[model samples]
Target: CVHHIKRRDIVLKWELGEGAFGKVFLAECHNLLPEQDKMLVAVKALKEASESARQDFQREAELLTMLQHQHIVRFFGVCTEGRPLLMVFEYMRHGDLNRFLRSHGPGPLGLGQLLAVASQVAAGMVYLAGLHFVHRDLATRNCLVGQGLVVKIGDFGSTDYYRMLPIRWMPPESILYRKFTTESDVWSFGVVLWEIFTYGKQPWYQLSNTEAIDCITQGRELERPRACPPEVYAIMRGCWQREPQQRHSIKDVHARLQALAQAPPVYLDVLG
Candidate 1:
């Protein structure tokens, strides 16, 4: 469902952000289709894009346009009619989840608020799992927060140099052998859960890449964050199980999160 829009139709306003793929610009489209006229979109374009880069960029466009879920980023259109190929997406006001948490400083969110964030992320993963889409990267850094704390998953299989990939969020299999599956994604989600509970703390903190991998293979799990509730830690542990087959399914994880959201509130220590 990639709309072929003329490159001239989009007016780049300013750069929103940049990452392994390229820079994302805040842009506006003029005199577009009846339903999509005068829309502000995030235009993703590669910098010095190679042949492989173009293929990955094209694939991301196809995936986003094909998948329709509230928790997934909305793909508007693509401009391949000229150079600097661009893909348009709905601009996320809050930006990536990792940065959002960091900007909040020492203690900005309460226990319940953190729970809500984690729940939203799990709900998004549930949707992706149903579609059998394997998000090789599933960390807060790869998730974008929209208005109203909505979490939408992005950076699907957009491979970067191995050194650039966040090893802390990777599953054992992926780290060891580059194998990725929905189960592996579940493992990454576990790391993400740890991230939310810890308020953006890096996983395997203070450990070298080799040491981090060693720690995981040796059956050690991350220490629970001080503010994390016992129930949430239980879910995180479930996701970090050594064997992929033993890990909780995304659907089950979402169900548990939903249950937690409806459960009676409990008083937990939170920084104000």
Candidate 2:
């Protein structure tokens, strides 16, 4: 149940990059939220006015309404009053995790903080899984980083060039038969974990799409990121099991990550 208002002023500010089907802009709406005379929001404009565009836009809106977890980006409403279409969501101060990790890197965002982000993402996925929602495209680029290092999973597909297939993040089932389920999302989350550990590095950055596919089909997974705790790397491995049922559940992964939050990895000097 979202509100609809057209009388107020909806100001579109600078671009915040592109959404699945359109460009996103930082926006401001006045006299709409009742108590507030002004509101700050991120709005995605319809890239095209086609029927499919409208359906996808509305579908995402409906999905956002159903998703109300703290770690999930808040959806204010949708405005058809505008020429194209507009989806208003809470403005994340820091923006997406991909850029944030690039800017901050591992030095500033300590192991604990990175773990916290990963743990929060898993918690949100746990909620999503409970609702049976499969995030077809789950990656660092699709997760938003807000103030206080809060991470909320953003609702958008892959980027341009990241366009077409997301073989890099998806699993064997998805690539082979186009099967997408919460289990497959778990596979994607493993790649997201790799992204977190590398401080935003793109997964399979070394290989071509075909090679990446072969790597998975051959049962080889991503290498353990440098300085990444063996235990944490093991969790990533569990998520990448060949069989969907063999993969770790979101709740289990969340539990392990949450536990790791308090227990930092121990590094010892050898041959000193």
Candidate 3:
């Protein structure tokens, strides 16, 4: 669907979030176009953006246009012929999954809920993997939560986005070699999986950035989250394999998570 909205038509409301590239606003439209008329939309505005930022912004728009999946955020349009170039997308109700989980305290989600989120994210990544798209910034922080805890893979930033290359979420190869691939994304997913199971605890919580990178380089993996089931931890292990080729594909991860979801509830002791 080609949904285009002019910048003039959008009524910028409160700020949703701000970042290195631009600011996202809770916006509204006066003309009332489909999916563009209410507070249900977010506009990412790049005011005074660099040429590189502009290219990245356009690249993200193109990527979003080509991608259509239930677990991926929906793109509405772009407004380029304006002071602040804007990219519009469906507003996720609950904001980023990381913050959501943190707000709820430890293990807020039930086992079934956690598994649902893991499976949905893995399914979305499967589609991206099909397209050979490497989401270098895959982490709980990059995932958005919609109503009823619906999780969507998002924030596909430029490969060199500095603010996003957090050491805790990146694999050793990606950190040391600046190499990113589907396998690298799987490695990040393992960290995201850890976030969900730990109800958003920081991965390797006790380690500094340097320490974490050194640890991964030394072939050390994060310990399992409290109350995490053996099966789920096994999936995490598969994603964290030392060799990229040895890691499980997103399809395999999705299938495994779905299988876990379908089986009898393991009933994690959330308080542990």
Candidate 4:
């Protein structure tokens, strides 16, 4: 079980942003660690939530407590007895990769760094899949960037929309039948890789939700991003395969990504 923080132990700071469930804040956690007096943490408060949403929040908190991984965001604790129910996580300083990539495209984070980020996400998913945990929502926005641009999976709060299911990142099976499995996650991970290589552009950005799903069902996949290596794009292609059984396992995906990640930048460009 994870520690539950009382409201008094937190000095809730400025708003970070609003998530699908509610608003998130940067706060200072008091005396939570012996070596530190206080530390920065992110506090997520369900601002306008219903009872079902409240239950969903608790379920998400419980799930985070059981999952401990370097490439997964740290879940600190929760404050549930209070008026505004809340959960805390390690502060991801650089914010989500979705906006981060848009701000700093193809710079400081070169192809090597980009590959490193993708490998980390793949590593995280490998852990999740190993445990038979299905990440129903997997995308760059659901992934956070920490110091040095390290990407970690986060925001497993809810799947509210295609536009609640985040349809674009979803697999054909999930979109068609609402079926979510580890393989479905692999499909989504491929989209995440596309996001990274494209520097956070939304997949099927130009297509309407209905139109996008139609295209996906029609076997149309995302085109290769500019400057993306064919080898890397091949991985993305493997992930987007229509048959879940045909898609590569996260272990295989991570193995390939880790190998590519260990390669030199010049070598990567050579593949480009």
Candidate 5:
């Protein structure tokens, strides 16, 4: 359902977008300040849902409002009107990483570009991690690519404390068994890497979400994203390690991406 947000003289309507839990939209926002005024913002409208759903919405909104990182979506505020609840976010022109890569077609990312995106993601993840929170739902779709290929992680509806939430994005041990941790987030990060390398193919979408979770329970981890260079592939594998303790820290991820950016080795020769 769409709602009209009246900001001073402008009446902006938020257009619906894709989501299973609720609807999202793009709306025109304006600044009421003296100098800077009138700006467009992406408004996500989550209609009148259940109490549990509202709890989740509030949790995500608060998390988004609290978060501050270059590669993470900038949250404006929460708007609560009559029936529909809205979460305000900065509008990205190019949309999500999935659609962005689709426009490009699947291929190995350029060394410079890959490093730049990866570095920003890692830095953002590290920043989020420092806040004592883990992005359990980190994926390509959740990662929005703005200008300069600057990646901003979004869609926080799935984020929660490990003990409080079910094992949706991680193995059963990581969730129900009280094993969900920062390392589990690293596992999800590995999947995101695959999405980036494969140009955003839905992993195990052939399997239902339940089946996918079951597979992860039975030691079936996702394969590394295709067309990735050797070093990057190796880093991704480390992140995907079944043993959560063996996973790379967000700081480590940041360092690795930075190294790739500053001095990327010639993986083409190695493959040749």
Candidate 6:
């Protein structure tokens, strides 16, 4: 069901980004008819994926409708008129954190900015966790940026990580086994933090998925990203402990990041 928005002829502003499944277009609502005409919006047109994927997409949309948080992406509505599903939402100026980091390296970020972003994300996750929804695909690539330095989580392609084999961002228990818990998401959040710190570099490119799984299962973890301060590294390690239950909870994470946001800035010891 379409909610809170009317259909309009899209005046395509530009292409924001595209992935294997869809293209995101920056567009404006045409023929507003005495309303705001220059308003910007994002239209996500998804291509027809596999049949199984279509079902997953439906379920994902359902779950997303149930979720409401400041850090989570806003879902205006969905359109079912064509072969590919279309979703419309508010425009994010900076797009995903992955491209943002690639465009601007981590050096420009002071401690407060980093912690603020982290706290913002943690606040969203706390809400998700409270709602019993596991964001199985948490990563910097899925973290979206908006006005006022706001960060919102997006991209629900792999929401069913419990059924599918877990990818790089998932924790060991969730990957090698079929267990998906809030703690598992916390482990992935550590990887997200690493991405944020290292400016979107995949933490372990040389390692295969199997190797990464084995290492993580056998109590090894990807090294903390370069230039992560001691306090930040310590927090990341706390999230990536061998046992899933040992990882921080959403409440704990939010609290810790909130505390970090208030601390004085410290220049991290750099490593390449």
- Residue 254, candidate 4: Cα error in Å is 0.6
Which RMSD values do the candidates have, in order?
A: 3.0, 2.7, 3.1, 2.5, 5.2, 3.8
Ranked candidates, highest TM-score first = 4, 2, 3, 1, 6, 5
Clashing pairs in 2: none
User: All candidates' lDDT scores?
Assistant: 0.80, 0.83, 0.81, 0.85, 0.68, 0.74
Candidate with top lDDT is 4
Error of 1 at 152 (Å): 0.7
Residues 9-85, model 6: lDDT tens digits: 55667888787778889988644335776667788877776778678767867776777788888876666655557
Provide the global lDDT of candidate 1 against the true structure: 0.80
| Every model's TM-score | 0.89, 0.90, 0.89, 0.91, 0.78, 0.83
The residue-by-residue lDDT of candidate 1 on 83-152, one tens digit each, is 6888888878888888888776474877667777888888889888888888887888788888777878
**True lDDT of residue 9, candidate 3:** 82
> Which ranges in model 4 have alpha carbons more than 4 Å from their true place?
48-55, 106-108, 156-163, 265-272
For candidate 5, which ten residues in a row score worst on lDDT? 1-10
In model 3, the runs with Cα more than 4 Å from the true position are 30-39, 49-56, 156-164, 270-272
Clashes of each: 0, 0, 0, 4, 3, 0
Cα misplacement distance, residue 133 of candidate 5 (Å): 0.2
Pairs clashing in candidate 5?
31-38, 71-152, 174-180
Which candidate comes out best when scored by TM-score? 4
Give the true-structure RMSD of model 3.
3.1
Worst 10 residues of 2 by lDDT: 263-272
Per-residue lDDT, model 4, residue 20, is 62
| Residue range 48-116, candidate 5, lDDT tens digits | 567887888778776666677777787777665545676677778778787887776645456566667
State the local distance difference test value for candidate 2. 0.83
Q: Write the per-residue lDDT of candidate 4 for residues 155-270, one digit (tens) a residue.
A: 64532255567888888788888899999999999999999988888889888888888998878989988757888899999998889999999999999999989983453443
Better of 1 and 2 by TM-score: 2
Off by over 4 Å in 6: 1-5, 30-37, 49-59, 81-84, 156-166, 270-272
Ranking by lDDT: 4, 2, 3, 1, 6, 5
